[PDB]
Amino acid sequence: MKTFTAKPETVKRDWYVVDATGKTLGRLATELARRLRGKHKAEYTPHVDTGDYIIVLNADKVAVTGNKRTDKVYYHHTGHIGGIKQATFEEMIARRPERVIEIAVKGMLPKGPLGRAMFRKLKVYAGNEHNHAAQQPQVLDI
Amino acid sequence: MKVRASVKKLCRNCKIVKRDGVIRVICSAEPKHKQRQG
Amino acid sequence: SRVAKAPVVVPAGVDVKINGQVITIKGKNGELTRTLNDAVEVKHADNTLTFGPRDGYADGWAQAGTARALLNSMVIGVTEGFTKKLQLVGVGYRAAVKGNVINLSLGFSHPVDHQLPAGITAECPTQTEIVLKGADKQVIGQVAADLRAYRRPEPYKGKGVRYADEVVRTKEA
Amino acid sequence: LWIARINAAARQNGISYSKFINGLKKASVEIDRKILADIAVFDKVAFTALVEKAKAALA
Amino acid sequence: MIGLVGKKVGMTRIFTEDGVSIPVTVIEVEANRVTQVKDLANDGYRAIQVTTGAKKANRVTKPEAGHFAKAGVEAGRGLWEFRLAEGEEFTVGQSISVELFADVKKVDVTGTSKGKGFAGTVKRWNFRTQDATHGNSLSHRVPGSIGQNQTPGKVFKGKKMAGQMGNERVTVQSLDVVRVDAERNLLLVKGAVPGATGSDLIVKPAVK
RNA sequence: GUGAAGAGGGAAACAACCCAGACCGCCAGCUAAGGUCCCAAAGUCAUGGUUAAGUGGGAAACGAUGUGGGAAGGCCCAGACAGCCGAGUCGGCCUGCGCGGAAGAU
RNA sequence: GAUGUCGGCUCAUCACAUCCUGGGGCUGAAGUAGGUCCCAAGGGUAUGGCUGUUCGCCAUUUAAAGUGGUACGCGAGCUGG
RNA sequence: GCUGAAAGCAUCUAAGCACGAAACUUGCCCCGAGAUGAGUUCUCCCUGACCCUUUAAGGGUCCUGAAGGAACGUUGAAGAC
């Protein structure tokens, strides 16, 4: 015999919805990344995608501990000489709330084409409403 | 203000207080006694 | 601790309402409201208020003491009130009141106009003296400090705006 | 690969991989990881029976 | 507030009774006709669209004809857009004339500047020339050095080099309004503005 | 003792450091150094303590009512300390973990 | 079995132990004008006589004529004292 | 700086509240949906018959050729092409 392998043309996927109100950022990101990769199904295969679709609501109400709300800094560079720029957690929540969860989740996924494709199944919203009622998602409590 | 590494009371009206992570000396009799650790 | 173990008497004519951590005190001079820390418990025995720590917090007694002092000040304010007095020293310095605005002349190339907040009253029983009246200790103190900051007392002659009962040291050249 | 699949199957029945292996060792079962993964994918009633055996041994 | 679209005629001067000469640019502003109103519910912002001029029938394609016929206006030589401030209303088919500037004092003018083509660093960036004598060898108007040694070992982004010059969008701010003539559709402003004779201009009230 | 003339696992990468000496095949099992939230295989294990500095994840002489533990002292219901009447308050010693001193060139 | 070494010209880019402009505390700070320490890198920051000079002295200006790293920046970009 | 306990006093701080610079984020000017996360709005054009086969986002024959675009010519205050 030979060991079983999944096939991208015959996998099954499902839709879930999650609420981020009062949750801890990193401890929520671990679960999101686990379920996007597909490490909770017995059919897991490293070179195939076997995850689920997840909607995240209320992204502007996620929590941090200690003095991090004013002391965590996000950096980036623009490509021009001298172009190093930064922002704080409060500033980020004020102008682009969804990027906070997006960056954390992207850091915990594999690097490469398959990881980039895994990232596409995440849908993040800052309020309490979405427009995906035709997919009939089920509630997931994390 | 005197900024230095060793700060201490110089007379009986001096007081030691801690404000926002810094050690300071404030005096009610002599303005020359005002000190900050740094 | 010691401060927090002394209860607050609630005299006749003052209404006390408690809702979770919000307290409202009403009296002849007005109404005041405040929200307290989540590590203090306040009880209304019969005519007294008592304060105590809650189990699960490591700084209960300090918070209890602060809350006690604040509530006592509220009760005094809603029956008697608070007043402050300011004095002007110098040549050509003057003050006046119109409505809820104070006009000050203090040796500048432009006049100073100050707008009072809601709940504070002012009077000028002389061109060189101001009296403020109110029912909020913090607000009255802040207004007095803002007024004083326009020209602070100076060390060679004493000129400026001062509190009535303040000592101003002087020196020579 | 075999170990990862076994972990996924066991946590859906309510136990972790390490406790599962310990329980099988105490119950004197000698099935290896290849066969356990095969059964995990192709026959789930049998895998539930094995998990019950391990839990009874650990109790 | 909104602005208007005009055409550049040329330059002249005005003599005052006190003995002063003012150099002026003449701008012709015909009637601007409203073609579309965009609101918040349908588009997400508040603006109007305008046309001006004339165009021959055998050069207007069918899509353009249908768009103009929905509004009920004659075809012009282009379409432009202006953003609206709170408290402003307009309707489709309305006309706007130069009398909008009857009480404005200063304006901003926008146009497309003249073309010079491929240009060197002396003309494009004000570099200095090297010696014309004293033994120079084929290096008179050349740029010189463009970097450092092994550290960093590349050329930085934004470096100043030779290339295309002119033929782009430019704005000049805070120009005096000298005259408004409604009988002849003329606006006279003080100073020079970008472009060549016969090009299109956009005129707005000043922002500063 | 190792490399030279030595492959495999750990220390991000890293001849000479730690574990260990490759005759050939296998889609079997147990362990060493080192490890078990996700990148990435395995405890979001159990019981009692300490830290609030992101210390952990760079550095001294020296300075300070940060705060956990231990053994002795002076005063005090015959009224102590502070301020202007009613239970505690003073200063040394030994020891655990933190704070300042702490400025560099894509 | 080769990585061209001082000075000048053209073109620059970063640090902060800050020369000017901005904000403060103490003064043996009356005012004008000064001394010393703390915060701050947005922008700005001479022309000539002598000498191969980098430096340096002298003449006359300026709010000011900062200190350092980049193969003591830069010859498949120029010169050759 | 205001109000305020631990520490019956005092204390800008531990809980609360107010000021404060050419440095930071905006306000001014230019590029910008290859933003593969490839967005929105207005208008315009196309309304025939059959056959085969391994039966499906299948292959072929006849009739039809729109909105628009490109090519050519006379050329520009646009331009190395």
Q: Could you identify the residue whose CA is nearest to the C1' atom of nucleotide H77?
A: E196
Please choose, from the candidates E99, E54, E49, E88, the residue with its C-alpha nearest in 3D space to the C-alpha of residue E71: E49
Provide the 3-class DSSP secondary structure of residue C146.
helix
CA atoms of E142 and E157, how far apart (whole Å): 20
What domain range is C72 assigned to?
Answer: 8-76
- Looking at the structure, tell me whether residues C51 and C118 fall in a common domain: no
Phi-psi region of C150 (alpha: psi -120 to 50; beta: other; left: phi over 0): alpha
Structure tokens at C121: 């009253």
Q: What is the DSSP letter of E129?
A: P
- C170 in a structural domain: no
Please choose, from the candidates A126, A85, A89, A114, the residue with its C-alpha nearest in 3D space to the C-alpha of residue A104: A89
Compare all CA atoms of chain A with the CA of D5 and give the residue at the minimum distance: A42
CA atoms of C8 and C133, how far apart (whole Å): 24
Helix (H) or strand (E) run with residue D55 in it: helix D44-58
Q: Are C116 and C100 in contact (CB under 8 A)?
A: yes
CA atoms of C117 and E92, how far apart (whole Å): 50
CA atoms of E29 and E22, how far apart (whole Å): 21
Decide the pairing of beta strands A15-19 and A53-57. Answer: parallel
Q: Are A142 and A28 in contact (CB under 8 A)?
A: yes
Contact E158 A79 (CB under 8 A): no
Interatomic separation, CA of residue E57 and C1' of nucleotide G53, rounded (Å): 79
Question: Is any atom of nucleic acid chain G found less than 7 Å from the CB of residue E128?
Answer: yes
Question: Is any atom of nucleic acid chain H found less than 7 Å from the CB of residue B1?
Answer: no
What domain range is E19 assigned to?
Answer: 1-208
CA atoms of C62 and C2, how far apart (whole Å): 10
How distant is the Cα of A97 from the closest Cα of chain E, in angstroms?
21
E79 exposure class (CB count in 10 Å sphere: 0-12, 13-18, 19+): middle
- Looking at the structure, tell me whether residues C89 and C159 fall in a common domain: yes
Sheet of B35-37: strand order equals B2-4, B35-37, B22-27, B14-19
Q: How was this structure determined?
A: cryo-EM
Please choose, from the candidates A83, A13, A5, A100, the residue with its C-alpha nearest in 3D space to the C-alpha of residue A44: A5
Which domain-ending residue is among C38, C56, C76? C76
Q: Is the dihedral of CA C88, C90, C95, C101 positive or negative?
A: negative
Please choose, from the candidates A14, A16, A13, the residue with its C-alpha nearest in 3D space to the C-alpha of residue A49: A13
SS (HEC) of B1-38: CEEECCCCCCCCCEEEEEECCEEEEEECCCHHHCEEEC
Cβ density class C141-167: b for 16+ within 10 Å, e for less: eebbeebbeebebeeeeebbbbeeeee
- Looking at the structure, tell me whether residues C146 and C104 fall in a common domain: yes
Strand H: which residues 120-159 of E lie within 7 A (CB)?
none
Crossing angle for the helix pair D17-27 and D2-11, to the nearest 10 degrees:
90
Which domain-ending residue is among C76, C107, C124? C76
Count the domains in chain C.
Answer: 2
Cβ contacts (< 8 Å) between D37 and chain A: which residues?
Answer: 3
In the numeric block, the tokens 């951590």 are attached to: C21
Provide the 3-class DSSP secondary structure of residue A4.
coil
Q: Are C112 and C98 in contact (CB under 8 A)?
A: no
Residue C148 C-beta-side C-alpha neighbours within 13 Å: 19
- Report how far Cα A53 is from the mean position of its chain's Cα atoms: 10
CA atoms of D38 and A42, how far apart (whole Å): 10
For residue D22, what are the contacts with CB-CB under 8 A and spacing of at least 6?
D54, D58
Which domain-ending residue is among C45, C76, C107? C76
Cβ contacts (< 8 Å) between A44 and chain D: which residues?
Answer: 4-5, 8
SS (HEC) of A46-111: CCCCCCCEEEEECHHHCECCCCHHHHCEEEEECCCCCCEEEEEHHHHHHHCHHHHHHHHHHHCCCC
Q: Are C86 and C166 in contact (CB under 8 A)?
A: no
Decide the pairing of beta strands A138-139 and A122-124. Answer: unpaired
CATH number for the domain that contains residue C41: 3.90.930.12
CA atoms of C74 and C81, how far apart (whole Å): 9
- C172 in a structural domain: no
- Looking at the structure, tell me whether residues C158 and C110 fall in a common domain: yes
Peptide bond into E152 cis (omega under 30): yes
How many Cβ atoms sit within 10 Å of the Cβ of residue E33?
21
Q: Are C132 and C83 in contact (CB under 8 A)?
A: yes
For residue B31, what are the contacts with CB-CB under 8 A and spacing of at least 6?
none
Decide the pairing of beta strands B35-37 and B22-27. Answer: antiparallel
Count the domains in chain E.
Answer: 1
Q: Are A137 and A125 in contact (CB under 8 A)?
A: no
Question: Is any atom of nucleic acid chain H found less than 7 Å from the CB of residue C165?
Answer: no
Backbone angles phi, psi at D10, to 5 degrees: -70, -40
Nucleotide nearest to A67 (CA to C1'): F54
Resolution (angstroms) equals 2.2
How many Cβ atoms sit within 10 Å of the Cβ of residue B5?
6
What are the C-alpha distances in Å from E42 to residues A129, B1, E45, E93, E139? Answer: 21, 63, 9, 20, 62
Structure tokens at A74: 């996000």
- C171 in a structural domain: no
Domain boundaries, chain A: 1-142
Crossing angle for the helix pair A97-107 and A25-37, to the nearest 10 degrees:
60
